[PDB]
Amino acid sequence: PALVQRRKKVAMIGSGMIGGTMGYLCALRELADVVLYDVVKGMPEGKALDLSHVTSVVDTNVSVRAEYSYEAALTGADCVIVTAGLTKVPGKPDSEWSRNDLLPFNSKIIREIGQNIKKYCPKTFIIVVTNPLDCMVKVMCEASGVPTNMICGMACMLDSGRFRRYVADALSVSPRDVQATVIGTHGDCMVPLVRYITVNGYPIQKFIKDGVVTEKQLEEIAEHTKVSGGEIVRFLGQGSAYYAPAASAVAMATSFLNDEKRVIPCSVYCNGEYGLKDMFIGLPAVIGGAGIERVIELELNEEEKKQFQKSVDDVMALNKAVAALQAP
Amino acid sequence: ALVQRRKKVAMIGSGMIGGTMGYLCALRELADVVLYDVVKGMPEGKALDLSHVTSVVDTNVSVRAEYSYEAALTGADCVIVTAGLTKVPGKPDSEWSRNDLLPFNSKIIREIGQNIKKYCPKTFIIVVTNPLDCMVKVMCEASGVPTNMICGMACMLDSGRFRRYVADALSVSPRDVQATVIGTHGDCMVPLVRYITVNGYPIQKFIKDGVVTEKQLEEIAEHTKVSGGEIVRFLGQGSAYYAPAASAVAMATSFLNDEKRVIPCSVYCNGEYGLKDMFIGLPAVIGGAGIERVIELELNEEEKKQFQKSVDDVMALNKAVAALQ
Amino acid sequence: PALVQRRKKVAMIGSGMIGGTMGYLCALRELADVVLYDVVKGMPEGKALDLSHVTSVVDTNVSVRAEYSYEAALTGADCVIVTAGLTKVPGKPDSEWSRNDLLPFNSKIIREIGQNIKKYCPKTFIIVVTNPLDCMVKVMCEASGVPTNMICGMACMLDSGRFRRYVADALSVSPRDVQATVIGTHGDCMVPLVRYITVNGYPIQKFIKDGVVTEKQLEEIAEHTKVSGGEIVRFLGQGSAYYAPAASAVAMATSFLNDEKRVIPCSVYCNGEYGLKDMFIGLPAVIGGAGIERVIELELNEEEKKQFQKSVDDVMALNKAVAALQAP
Amino acid sequence: PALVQRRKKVAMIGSGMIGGTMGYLCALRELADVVLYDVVKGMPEGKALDLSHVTSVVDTNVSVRAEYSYEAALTGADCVIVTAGLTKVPGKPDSEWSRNDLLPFNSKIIREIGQNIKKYCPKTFIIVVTNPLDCMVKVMCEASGVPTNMICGMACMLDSGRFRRYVADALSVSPRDVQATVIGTHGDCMVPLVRYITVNGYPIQKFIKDGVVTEKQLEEIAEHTKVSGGEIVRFLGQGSAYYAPAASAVAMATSFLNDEKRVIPCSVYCNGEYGLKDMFIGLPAVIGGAGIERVIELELNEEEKKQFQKSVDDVMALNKAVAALQ
Ligand SMILES: CC(=O)c1ccc[n+]([C@@H]2O[C@H](COP(=O)([O-])OP(=O)(O)OC[C@H]3O[C@@H](n4cnc5c(N)ncnc54)[C@H](O)[C@@H]3O)[C@@H](O)[C@H]2O)c1
Numbered sequence A, C: 001p002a003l004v005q006r007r008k009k010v011a012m013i014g015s016g017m018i019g020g021t022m023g024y025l026c027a028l029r030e031l032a033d034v035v036l037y038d039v040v041k042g043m044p045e046g047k048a049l050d051l052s053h054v055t056s057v058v059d060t061n062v063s064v065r066a067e068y069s070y071e072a073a074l075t076g077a078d079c080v081i082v083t084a085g086l087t088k089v090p091g092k093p094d095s096e097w098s099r100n101d102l103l104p105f106n107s108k109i110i111r112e113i114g115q116n117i118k119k120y121c122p123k124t125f126i127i128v129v130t131n132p133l134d135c136m137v138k139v140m141c142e143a144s145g146v147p148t149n150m151i152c153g154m155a156c157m158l159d160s161g162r163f164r165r166y167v168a169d170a171l172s173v174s175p176r177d178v179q180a181t182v183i184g185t186h187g188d189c190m191v192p193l194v195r196y197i198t199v200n201g202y203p204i205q206k207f208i209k210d211g212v213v214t215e216k217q218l219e220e221i222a223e224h225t226k227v228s229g230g231e232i233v234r235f236l237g238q239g240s241a242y243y244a245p246a247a248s249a250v251a252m253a254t255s256f257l258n259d260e261k262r263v264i265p266c267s268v269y270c271n272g273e274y275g276l277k278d279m280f281i282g283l284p285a286v287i288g289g290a291g292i293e294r295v296i297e298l299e300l301n302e303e304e305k306k307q308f309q310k311s312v313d314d315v316m317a318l319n320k321a322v323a324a325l326q327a328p
Numbered sequence B: 001a002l003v004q005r006r007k008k009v010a011m012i013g014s015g016m017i018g019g020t021m022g023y024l025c026a027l028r029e030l031a032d033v034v035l036y037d038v039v040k041g042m043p044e045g046k047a048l049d050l051s052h053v054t055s056v057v058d059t060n061v062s063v064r065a066e067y068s069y070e071a072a073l074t075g076a077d078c079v080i081v082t083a084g085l086t087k088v089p090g091k092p093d094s095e096w097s098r099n100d101l102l103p104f105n106s107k108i109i110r111e112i113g114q115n116i117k118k119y120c121p122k123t124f125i126i127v128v129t130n131p132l133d134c135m136v137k138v139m140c141e142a143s144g145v146p147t148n149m150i151c152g153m154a155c156m157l158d159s160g161r162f163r164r165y166v167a168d169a170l171s172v173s174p175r176d177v178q179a180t181v182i183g184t185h186g187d188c189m190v191p192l193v194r195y196i197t198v199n200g201y202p203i204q205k206f207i208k209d210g211v212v213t214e215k216q217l218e219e220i221a222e223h224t225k226v227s228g229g230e231i232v233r234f235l236g237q238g239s240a241y242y243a244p245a246a247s248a249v250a251m252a253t254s255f256l257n258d259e260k261r262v263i264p265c266s267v268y269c270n271g272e273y274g275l276k277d278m279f280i281g282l283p284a285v286i287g288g289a290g291i292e293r294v295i296e297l298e299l300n301e302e303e304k305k306q307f308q309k310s311v312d313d314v315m316a317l318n319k320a321v322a323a324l325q
Numbered sequence D: 001p002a003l004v005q006r007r008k009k010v011a012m013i014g015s016g017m018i019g020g021t022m023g024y025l026c027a028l029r030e031l032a033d034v035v036l037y038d039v040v041k042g043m044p045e046g047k048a049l050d051l052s053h054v055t056s057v058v059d060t061n062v063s064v065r066a067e068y069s070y071e072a073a074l075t076g077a078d079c080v081i082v083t084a085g086l087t088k089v090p091g092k093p094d095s096e097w098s099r100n101d102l103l104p105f106n107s108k109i110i111r112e113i114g115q116n117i118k119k120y121c122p123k124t125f126i127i128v129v130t131n132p133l134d135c136m137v138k139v140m141c142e143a144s145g146v147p148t149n150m151i152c153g154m155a156c157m158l159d160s161g162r163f164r165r166y167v168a169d170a171l172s173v174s175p176r177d178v179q180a181t182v183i184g185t186h187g188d189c190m191v192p193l194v195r196y197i198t199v200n201g202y203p204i205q206k207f208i209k210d211g212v213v214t215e216k217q218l219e220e221i222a223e224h225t226k227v228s229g230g231e232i233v234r235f236l237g238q239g240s241a242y243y244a245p246a247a248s249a250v251a252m253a254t255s256f257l258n259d260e261k262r263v264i265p266c267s268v269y270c271n272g273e274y275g276l277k278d279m280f281i282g283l284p285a286v287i288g289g290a291g292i293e294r295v296i297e298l299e300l301n302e303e304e305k306k307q308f309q310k311s312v313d314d315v316m317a318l319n320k321a322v323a324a325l326q
């Protein structure tokens, strides 16, 4: 008979570590049918077969397929999660790893994908993952032409996730009950908001006063959060983090697909908030069935504003450079 | 030959909340379940129905009714007690009061505690029976368990109500609303409006941004305080059970899986706020060692006043029980 | 901004034990927004409040609301699960409890609800629970006017669930790995297919030959399955089973909402199966996004056909009676 | 306060593709604390950090740690899942990929791990994944000395999963409702039991008669199942399957840890089934809190017996080869 309830469809544009991992979460949770697309042929088909086998093992039913063209991959996608691009610059020491160095390699890839989203699924919700994140979300926004509430970048949920894990270990509590947020650009200028940390809404200052943790410990945790990505790159040897990045992107996609209205910090379009316009930066936001439904403006004190401003400068300079170098 | 044994949770009281908690256990494959009650037949009916659920949802736990304390309690990793009454016989809904349940619920709780002492002294006890904070103390005295191994479920429910109302007002998921109620479960409970956060962000900025008003938050705190009576009035008979059951099982799961969740509940006071030898609702950390932390938040003038009234109420009920026996 | 992904909506018409329990599963699983409707004033509002509180406790976000008009309850419903009606005949001994006795009390209620579905949500998937089940599904089909693939009755998943639990206990295996099915009408004439029992696809006959279970043990399990409903009625004293019935109806609703294509025996429309036409009866079926997508016809031996024919004769007689007494 | 309820602990010995993936499942489901161990330094610490970050993201609380010594990785492990070893033979064309050729490189690795399990966690439940599977489980068995019911190898749940997925696609039903089993030795000689395929317990034969699937189609599906591992190796270019293998191993571990008593085909110790003794081969088994609680012997028809004997010959030759090596 005629299909009345159609499964959601999520397209993974980029089927490397993060793309395959997100496909895994979808199959494991029966969240949506999955399409894997990559410029590398053969590999997506292998992962799609492996992921299709997972559905039997875990008793779920979603279709996982590799698609070779942008048209087949993007058509009908409720959400498109983009991880296409490079993770490290070839021929460079891990000690010198920088997300900003990826700019010249990844801007063109992200722009091309955006042009195809405009053509095949202009109504989709786009979640960008490719680094340098905040810069790439802007490139994607310009190329895809989608409404600004229908595009965001995954980064701060991961940075906040790291921040929360470290605080949870220091306090001996579940990270479910630590609210710690990182805002700003995803990189060395990110801003872990130590002053705002709460444990089930209780101020972290209470735990400092009680003698469970010290300010020094918290600042060390904030620094650890900032260098966590590079730490994993150095330990892995090849590639970068993927389990938590994938879980973060899918958590965001799920808040959209199920209209959950979760409050998740992510790279979002600024139209005045914090005084910024025509750019994307990591800020707390509400993700629901209408995409980015609210961008939360936090009051920042002198030091916080100074840190955030540096973040703002990094991304504004990079965005200008990208605009300057863009092929007509 | 058995190396890994399933956890076992004993529901002492198999009425609305007891059966509902058994359902959560069967749905999540959390633990084997025993349903115990003084009413004959009913627990066997619910145990059968719940055993059928395991097939429907593809899980495998044992759900059985037991009519003896020895069979119900032996081997229990956690005992959740709901045995007792929900309303005073021959009393109007507009006169419903949790404190009026102190009469014989007190003897019921004492008997159960004596049996836990005998059959599963190493268990973690979660009391639900009203008047909650008062009954937890009776249970602690009768059972003899370490003070970190007993608590009462109340504030997670009150906090859940508080959170749902704030979430609706802000249009966000309640997962991201941290709102807490402390004190004694009743008209004197204390909703901590000052401590409401949205994913850790102070509610104060949402007020300034015009998302919610101060009057609206006050109304939400008041609604939280009377939510139980509201449900009692609407149901006509009995009281809430879905959220109370989910709260008790969330607490049991944090213990069984050593999660270390921060959950407000009725806990033993070892000097906090100058309180000793009593239980009252406070934020706590529940892990594999039971209650592992009790948080003593800084209260503002209004909260101190309200909390003192909560304390007066508890100490008076405890005084009353000491009068009975 | 404009809503793009709307949550599914399930209307519980009848907010008694089963209706409230199904609302609970929806809130626990973030499956759908829920509406509780009943002719009893007040009670649905109390349950809706309780269930809304559950969403905070378990960290989900769905709307649970009570509605007192058919229009508010049914409009926009992706799936309608109907439990409205009596469970026992007033003043009759539990020893004489019979689902068929409920016929004159529940037929008018089911017809009225169907007439409202026809007006308010003609594209919904209807799952009837009200007894006597197979007769009520037919009344609902005629009254609602929905396509025959968009209506079914929940019974055999429950009967089979019971059958499976008893066999799983006998073999000391998880019921996940016991496939046991009951077909026919939900009542004393239901047919537990002992011959078809499998353990992860392996025939039960091998477990008999190897001494794990006996023929009598299996016959007693089938008998226990048939009398399970009444056994619970007698133990409870008031009302009938609700936890497993609720889980079964929601499992069926989920297979439709998520287009899972699970194989679940349920009361479905017959268009030739066993020479049966214009009636509903419990049979294995595939439930997907297009509703009942396939009705499975099993080969029955002499004894099975005899038992099934008895089921058929009972429901056909009752369906004729109901039609003869229907208000003009 | 003294700890009363301790989380389960699962040790992943081998932190490559499958080991890290299994750690992911544990973190996502809050199944157990996880230890990642590997001979490669650095990488396990990187994966452990990444996985610890996942717990915050998905609101769970388990500890994920890398450990570089056997003592630290194995002590207190309720279950040990072993993937340590090689996936492909260096300098060997993918067109020539063979699990059997991995024997000389992995036999010593597995024996060493087994000796360490004996020393540090003799009461653990061992799940072996390293290829050639049935052969490696026997090596693990001899080296660890654990009770015969506390060791098994993961392979047939994965092969059956593939089998089930293809049948589910052909029938347009959820694979939850397809019961299809592969028994024997994990390799080109595995035995997909077509005759034992059921759809929620209903014989596949009726679906053939109803015209939903043909007999030829079912045979093609059995063939596809046999060559699925190599099909993925071919497409991937480097490495082999890991998502479904990881999910299968963890499903087995979960059936043990929560005493679920699921019926899962896996490589188990034979006490006379099919006249097989002192060896492991893939057979339907019940996995519960007492480990392998039952091994199911199915009646085989002529064709199935012929195919199964080839499976038996395959593993017996491998075990003979190992006895000759070490
Ligand atoms: C923002 C944040 O928190 C975060 C975290 C981790 C990684 N990342 C970035 O996410 C991206 C992917 O990481 P990964 O998955 O580990 O990397 P990796 O495993 O290398 O996969 C990237 C994949 O994209 C493919 N690809 C390259 N060019 C194209 C193209 N033009 N079109 C389609 N596919 C293409 C490539 O073949 C490869 O399979 C990188 O840019 C990372 O730096 C961001």
Ligand SMILES: CC(=O)c1ccc[n+]([C@@H]2O[C@H](COP(=O)([O-])OP(=O)(O)OC[C@H]3O[C@@H](n4cnc5c(N)ncnc54)[C@H](O)[C@@H]3O)[C@@H](O)[C@H]2O)c1
Residues within 6 Å of the ligand: B012, B013, B014, B015, B016, B017, B018, B036, B037, B038, B039, B082, B083, B084, B085, B086, B087, B101, B108, B128, B129, B130, B132, B153, B154, B155, B157, B185, B238, B239, B240, B241, B244
């Ligand atoms: C603290 C909090 O938030 C909260 C919320 C909701 C209900 N409660 C209380 O929880 C309790 C149970 O509520 P309910 O389940 O809805 O009530 P209900 O459905 O009446 O069940 C209580 C059950 O306990 C049984 N019982 C009575 N005496 C004994 C005894 N000596 N031993 C064993 N069982 C006995 C009784 O037969 C009945 O089945 C009541 O005291 C409620 O007031 C507390």
Ligand SMILES: CC(=O)c1ccc[n+]([C@@H]2O[C@H](COP(=O)([O-])OP(=O)(O)OC[C@H]3O[C@@H](n4cnc5c(N)ncnc54)[C@H](O)[C@@H]3O)[C@@H](O)[C@H]2O)c1
Residues within 6 Å of the ligand: C013, C014, C015, C016, C017, C018, C019, C037, C038, C039, C040, C083, C084, C085, C086, C087, C088, C102, C106, C109, C129, C130, C131, C133, C154, C155, C158, C186, C239, C240, C241, C242, C245
């Ligand atoms: C088929 C099967 O397996 C199965 C299993 C269990 C129960 N049932 C039946 O399911 C039905 C519901 O059982 P229950 O929930 O336990 O019963 P119960 O708790 O009594 O609730 C039925 C509800 O329907 C309400 N109701 C009555 N008339 C109307 C009306 N005109 N419009 C709207 N609501 C109305 C009534 O007020 C009550 O709240 C009964 O008919 C049972 O026999 C079937």
Ligand SMILES: CC(=O)c1ccc[n+]([C@@H]2O[C@H](COP(=O)([O-])OP(=O)(O)OC[C@H]3O[C@@H](n4cnc5c(N)ncnc54)[C@H](O)[C@@H]3O)[C@@H](O)[C@H]2O)c1
Residues within 6 Å of the ligand: D013, D014, D015, D016, D017, D018, D019, D037, D038, D039, D040, D083, D084, D085, D086, D087, D102, D109, D129, D130, D131, D133, D154, D155, D156, D158, D186, D239, D240, D241, D242, D245
């Ligand atoms: C039975 C079955 O169905 C199945 C399916 C897929 C893979 N496998 C096998 O499973 C194994 C793991 O596959 P993978 O994870 O993809 O491979 P891979 O990613 O290469 O990881 C194997 C890991 O083991 C490590 N290792 C090597 N020697 C030792 C040692 N002595 N001690 C500790 N660690 C060591 C190695 O450094 C690497 O990190 C291989 O043997 C595969 O052939 C079996």
